[PDB]
Design a protein around this ligand. Structure first.
Ligand SMILES: [Fe+3]
Ligand SMILES: [Fe+3]
Ligand SMILES: [Fe+3]
Ligand SMILES: [Fe+3]
Ligand SMILES: [O-]
Ligand SMILES: [O-]
Lengths: 323, 491, 84, 491, 323, 84
């Protein structure tokens, strides 16, 4: 007879008592159990082929992805605690800054800057949502997938803040077209085509490894420095404390995504040849990221400086990741 | 001051745009999206009836876990799991092993809609969906985890789906077909509408009720909570079917629902049916598995199907007669083959239980009782070895479950065989064989346990071999839940 | 050699895998099937004789006839009934 | 980034200033502050060992209630209170009625220090204290509230302290003397140090342990939680005693502690003693009330008193012999006078229980057993009317509790009478009479139930009269917890 | 035998099912059970006399104070929910505004304004704490006492915010004496003597009725308009967004105290002769309140305007209370 | 008239309020006390006689002597002992 264990059998002989995180997040995917036939059906189904090509056949290789650990060790239970805290904060700003008529004291020029540079971000934020939710359903291991899960929720969070604020701005300035014209700005404004080209193309990079890179290593730092960092500093200097603070709040999430992205790369570089794989995808996408920062920040005041600070900062992300 | 949800909600789901740097089909490949020629603009009519925003979510779900987890920490040192009826303990072990990781997998099924659904509203609701199943998967690992030092069997709450044990294969067979290998629009219907709205939302309600009656308030609390999340994402199938019917796709819709419901029924006939009619103590049985299905599942399906513009599946009549048999055989099989499962099957055929069975199912003793008579005699006559198998049962090639039906004085066991491309397939029902025929390409080269056996994939090719094959070893191999205690009432 | 067939024993509730020999007699096939059903969950019947019929079309095979002559598809399902 | 608590804490308690528009004595009247000539600057040395800030508080206490309240909502429909041993149900009814509103009152005792303590640190900690007792008072109303439809007795969780029932008077007697009518510095010592640090902090720990063993996880959860709040404010007496000794007030300090401990002991001898040695089932008794006091209360008092520079009270020896008797008599009284209380007293004198009593208290049957013998015979011989009283017992004028002690073959019942200003007072112990003598002005004109009776304040002047007087009526008037079930073992 | 009830016997025949609030907050005080002898001891004890003189003998009269209801219906459980929410908000501002060096961008003049007009408020805030905790232990009914309970905690909350911020300001500008010189400013700065005289005197008004008036009807509105309202608007215009927001946050608490204070007065005016009682105490204390607002606000920039706006606002409080 | 006294019956565990008459005999006092103790929670003793003694100083009162002559403070505590 088998003796009952003091932990999950796959964690046994771990030397240290497994955390709640290890207990509820590890070795969960089962499709990786049979590379030749990942799902319990015909091996020729189009979805069998999809996972085989884009998951198992990725150039980014490792012998035990399930070994990956989220540096923050997030779990559903702790994600809601942390975020419900953060939301109390942002929702608090919303409620009280509204109370002292913060939106009524913004200047006309700045209101137009928001209609062009702020509100249409709801499209780019949802796009990142779609992008990070794809990494989730194609990643090779459950701990990697989970990071993508919570990051997708943060993405929906940013989208949400933006949706809310757009309604408030439309109520305060019904003549600007708030809520109504963001789609045309997103689709036709030259300041958005840099970013729109980037994500639309990155959204069809089906390889799990390239997806991680295209969205997390290249696109996100670009969007975060452009829309959160640069527009955030401008908002503050322009009298918009709400957006200056809101932007900063969302950057807390972004920093978290960079932490696990960076950890995954750390692990990836143990395997010989991966750095080159990662640098090749970065080199393929980085050019589009520059074109995104340029088009967006060039249209902002002190654009040339914003474009330089952003390019520099986003690259710094990958630099210290050892790339 | 804050705004009312109704004032800004639409803006959270106003996210569709016209791709320019890539084509719509590249962005939304049909194999993953399943738009079925319905335009982006038409899918935009999608409108979930139950709305919720991110801040509401994190706040609500934060308190749910606070409660569920507190309950557990409070009844922890009480070690109820030790005084619990063996029929109950087996119930949980079975539940956690067959569902824990499948719940987590559902997270990915949600993620499929979240990324490939052309309906914006569908995309966000699915993001909360993937968050709901993340919890269900994690919480249902943390809970049974508390008992790993009590039996190696609890370790199966995590290991089951990673093994080749027949019930595990049966599980993955269902789930993979319904939510892991289907396009987005397909998933919303087969999983969300048919399985969650049609079965689990109410099952978990009954499961929670039973947990309580057994004195297991930790599990009762677990299921209730999880249950309260179901409606939030199980609602995603409704609007999809509306869109498909509203256009020229009523037959395609109908066919997915037909497939999904039957495949669900089968899994339900082996995981729930046996449990409420045999594992639960006689004095805790509110109604039979049949009454449960007629009252909490069947009526609702017809209503759902009526208000939606769809019809009742072609097999509806058969499905209802089946409520008198299927689960009884599915139970006899599991018990008769106990060493092949990771929980201890409760025979549930005591004199009292047998008369209850006769009341709920007139003619039971005339048929099913027959087999149990022979089994009981052998246990009384010191011939237990005649109550455990020497061969493998015939597995249905669709539901990967034993082919069984009415025995005794009304013998009616049938095999809906089919020859496709030089191979002979076996089906436990007309519907099962039909699910294969409408889309043969999807199951063609798959092989059930018996097929693998007959192909030398299991070595040694004996019973001890098939046991190491399905990762079973003394310690987790199932036997009679009450240690044949019920046999004394016949001596 | 061995040949696989699925046994649908009469009065039992399930079909079972039962290996036979290409040389077995329909009589000997039935005996190998009874092993897994009779006395396990189906009562014996001395006044009766066990016959074999292809499940699909109801064809009845003479008590003699060796598997080899029945023209069965491997894994074919067969009824094992009680009669005279 | 946030700061570490250790960096800004001192600033929260740097609140003393020199009044100019009013004098220090007007701002801090001695009768409410009790600075006792110790300067403002000297009281500023006060330093609570367990620190906490407002944000930490609301966060921590928010989750505690979330848990306690969730537990309750989860086991609510399970109606455990109905299957619970009567000895247990009585335990809770007694607990809620004698403590609920006294807990709420403590809120005010805290408020006294919060406003009149010259020690800044003492003032803030007391503000959390008043918040802690607000909860204890409210939570212990909400919980028993769930049972008001089960018996009018539960209504006493709120009504008890508002009545003149003897146990209620006994309660208010203690509490009012210790926390409602004493200066701030006095309250920190008598209540916080002697009663909460010395008795309840560990009592509630044992109470929570017993609740669990009885299968009452709702109450077990209630007490555990409440218990976790105790240390936060029970710590306030420590620093005060340090300051008083550090100056020229070691005798004043000593005397408050002496008074407070004994008065606590008495209340404890009637509310806890009877419960753990008679109301709790034999198979759930970990240790006797005596072993409990020697292990979890007495040893700690000596330690606390040693490290503090104080001595053991003059009555310490007597107090320990008393652990063999006091609560036994206090139990006989409550049971023998059941109609005078709002809960049903469990006799707890079955043959088995009696031998357990003999093991824990050698000589029990020789003495206490004696009385119970006569009582048992009458119940067996159909003379129950001889097991209920025709008169009132003599009440101690200090602890307003019956004057009782060793009976049987070692009869030793004494009355420590005293004549002060033409009136004759009765005391159940040397200590009780001493608490009166050191400060006669404080109890002089107060009157116990028997005094009021003897003065015509109770009309009619019979037993039925005294019942309407203490607001008792059929429905709440106590009787044998098990309906004299235990009597069958003697027939 | 008595039939068990469907609620507390003192709530029976209420026509409507009692709320959690009514169930855990009503008719709790028992000292009011015997006016001749409130405590279970000798009737001549100094504390017997104290309650008889200052509680039972108050000029402010009513036949059933226990009838009082808190308009907000606060209970320990709901107080911690609400406040833990608010704290997440304020603690969020603290954390993040620190992150972007908000204190380093304040001007030198404004830093000195904070050392004089802001930080020493820790003394006035604790003073109000002591003041509201006295109302709690002397009020005639448990529902009135409870309001005073939670209000006392809010007072400790304000004290706390201030303690925290003073440490941060001392770290950023160690040469100002932050944390070290507030006592001398409080005791010797002419801008604080108006308020210091007011509370020191109000702190010895032992009558429960006068205490309610002296602290809640007169002193608090003065302090709130002076330190929260006026200094808060100044802070904002001076570049201090943190204090501008913090101040506003605490004002949420203040508004709550005014709500229950106002409700109590509403109830008090049912009894003939109380309006006159209340107006007499107000008339006695109002003069000291003006002297407080004047001394404090006169020293602030645009002081004359601040003094007018505050006087006007605080009086408006009592005006609409029907006084 | 009635006079109150506290009865500390021997072998009982508690003092009880017991009204007597100023005219009662120490013998009659003891009888009124026994009522609330004997057969209630104290066994009778025929071979013995009930005597009365002031609890405070142990003074023994002659079986006769009426309350009125004992010089007792109302509510005074008295021992009721078994002797001869
Ligand atoms: Fe789920
Ligand atoms: Fe679900
Ligand atoms: Fe307490
Ligand atoms: Fe306490
Ligand atoms: O779900
Ligand atoms: O406490």
């Amino acid at each position: 007879a088998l003796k009952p264990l003091k932990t999950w059998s796959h964690l046994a002989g771990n030397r240290r008592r497994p955390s709640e995180y290890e207990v509820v997040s590890t070795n969960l995917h089962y499709f990786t159990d049979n590379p030749e036939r990942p799902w319990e059906l015909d091996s020729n189904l189009p979805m069998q082929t999809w996972y085989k090509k884009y998951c198992f056949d990725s150039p980014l290789k490792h012998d035990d992805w399930n070994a990956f650990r989220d540096p923050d060790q997030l779990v559903y239970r702790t994600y809601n605690l942390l975020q419900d805290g953060q939301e109390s904060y942002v929702q608090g700003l919303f409620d009280q800054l509204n109370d002292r008529g913060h939106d009524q004291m913004l200047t006309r020029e700045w209101v137009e800057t928001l209609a062009r540079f702020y509100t249409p971000a709801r499209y780019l934020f949802h796009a990142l949502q779609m992008g990070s939710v794809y990494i989730h359903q194609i990643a090779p291991a459950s701990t990697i997938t989970n990071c993508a899960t919570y990051e997708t929720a943060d993405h929906l969070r940013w989208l949400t803040h933006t949706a809310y604020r757009t309604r408030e701005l439309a109520n305060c300035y019904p003549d600007v077209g708030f809520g109504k014209r963001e789609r045309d700005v997103w689709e036709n404004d030259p300041a958005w085509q840099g970013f729109r080209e980037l994500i639309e193309k990155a959204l069809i990079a089906w390889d799990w490894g390239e997806a991680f890179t295209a969205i997390n290593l290249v696109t996100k730092p670009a969007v975060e420095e452009a829309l959160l960092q640069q527009l955030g500093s401008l908002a503050q200097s322009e009298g918009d404390t709400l957006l200056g603070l809101l932007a900063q709040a969302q950057k807390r999430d972004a920093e978290r995504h960079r932490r696990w992205s960076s950890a995954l790369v750390k692990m990836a570089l143990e395997k010989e040849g991966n750095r080159e794989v990662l640098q090749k995808w970065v080199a393929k996408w980085e050019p589009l990221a520059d074109k995104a920062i340029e088009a967006y920040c060039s249209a902002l005041p002190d654009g040339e400086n914003a474009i330089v600070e952003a390019k520099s900062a986003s690259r710094y992300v990958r630099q210290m990741m050892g790339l | 001051s804050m705004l009312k949800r109704e004032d800004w909600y639409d803006l959270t789901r106003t996210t569709n745009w016209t791709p320019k740097y890539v084509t719509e089909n590249e962005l939304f490949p049909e194999e993953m999206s399943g738009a079925r020629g319905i335009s982006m603009e038409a899918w935009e009519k999608y409108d979930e009836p139950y709305k919720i925003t991110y801040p509401e979510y994190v706040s609500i779900q934060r308190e749910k876990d606070s409660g569920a987890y507190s309950i557990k920490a409070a009844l922890e040192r009480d070690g109820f799991v030790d005084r619990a009826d063996p029929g109950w303990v087996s119930t949980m072990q079975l539940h956690f092993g067959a569902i824990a990781l499948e719940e987590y997998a559902a997270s990915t099924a949600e993620a499929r809609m979240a990324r490939f659904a052309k309906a914006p509203g569908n995309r966000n609701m699915a993001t909360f969906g993937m968050m709901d199943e993340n919890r269900h998967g994690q919480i249902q690992l943390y809970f049974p985890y508390a008992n790993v030092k009590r039996s190696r069997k609890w370790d199966w709450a995590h290991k089951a789906i990673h093994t080749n044990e027949w019930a595990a294969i049966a599980a993955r067979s269902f789930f993979d077909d319904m939510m892991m290998t289907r396009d987005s629009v397909a998933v919303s219907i087969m999983l969300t509408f048919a399985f969650e709205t049609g079965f689990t939302n109410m099952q978990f309600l009954g499961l929670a009720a039973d947990a309580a009656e057994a004195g297991d308030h930790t599990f009762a609390s677990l299921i209730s909570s999880i249950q309260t999340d179901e409606s939030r994402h199980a609602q995603q199938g409704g609007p999809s079917l509306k869109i498909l019917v509203e256009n020229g796709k009523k037959d395609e819709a109908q066919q997915m629902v037909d497939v999904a419901i039957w495949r669900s029924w089968k899994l339900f006939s082996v995981l729930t049916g046996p449990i409420m009619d045999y594992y639960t103590p006689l004095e805790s049985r509110n109604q039979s598995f049949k009454e449960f299905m007629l009252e909490w599942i069947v009526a609702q399906f017809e209503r759902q199907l009526l208000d939606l513009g769809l019809d009742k599946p072609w097999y509806w009549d058969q499905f209802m007669q089946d409520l008198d048999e299927t689960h009884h055989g599915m139970h006899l099989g599991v018990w008769y083959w106990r060493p092949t499962v990771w929980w201890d099957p409760a025979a549930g055929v005591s004199p009292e239980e047998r008369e209850w069975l006769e009341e709920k199912y007139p003619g039971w003793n005339d048929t099913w009782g027959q087999c149990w008579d022979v089994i009981t005699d052998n246990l009384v006559n010191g011939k237990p070895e005649l109550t455990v198998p020497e061969t493998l049962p015939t597995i249905c090639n669709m539901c990967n479950l034993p082919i069984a039906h009415t025995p005794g004085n009304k013998w009616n066991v049938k095999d809906y065989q089919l020859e496709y491309e030089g191979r002979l397939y076996h089906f436990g029902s007309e519907a099962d064989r039909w699910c294969f025929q409408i889309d043969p390409e999807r199951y063609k080269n798959h092989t059930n346990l018996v097929d693998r056996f007959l192909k030398g994939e299991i070595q040694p090719a004996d019973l001890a071999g098939a046991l190491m094959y399905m990762s079973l070893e003394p310690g987790v191999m199932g036997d009679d839940a009450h240690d044949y205690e019920w046999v004394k009432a016949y001596q | 050699a061995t040949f696989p067939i699925m046994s649908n024993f009469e009065r039992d509730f399930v079909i079972q895998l039962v290996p036979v020999d290409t040389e077995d007699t329909m009589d000997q096939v039935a005996e190998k099937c009874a092993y897994h059903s009779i006395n396990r969950r189906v009562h014996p019947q001395p006044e009766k004789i066990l016959r074999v019929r292809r499940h699909e079309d109801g064809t009845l095979f003479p008590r003699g006839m060796i598997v080899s002559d029945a023209g069965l598809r491997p894994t074919e399902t067969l009824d094992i009934i009680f009669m005279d």
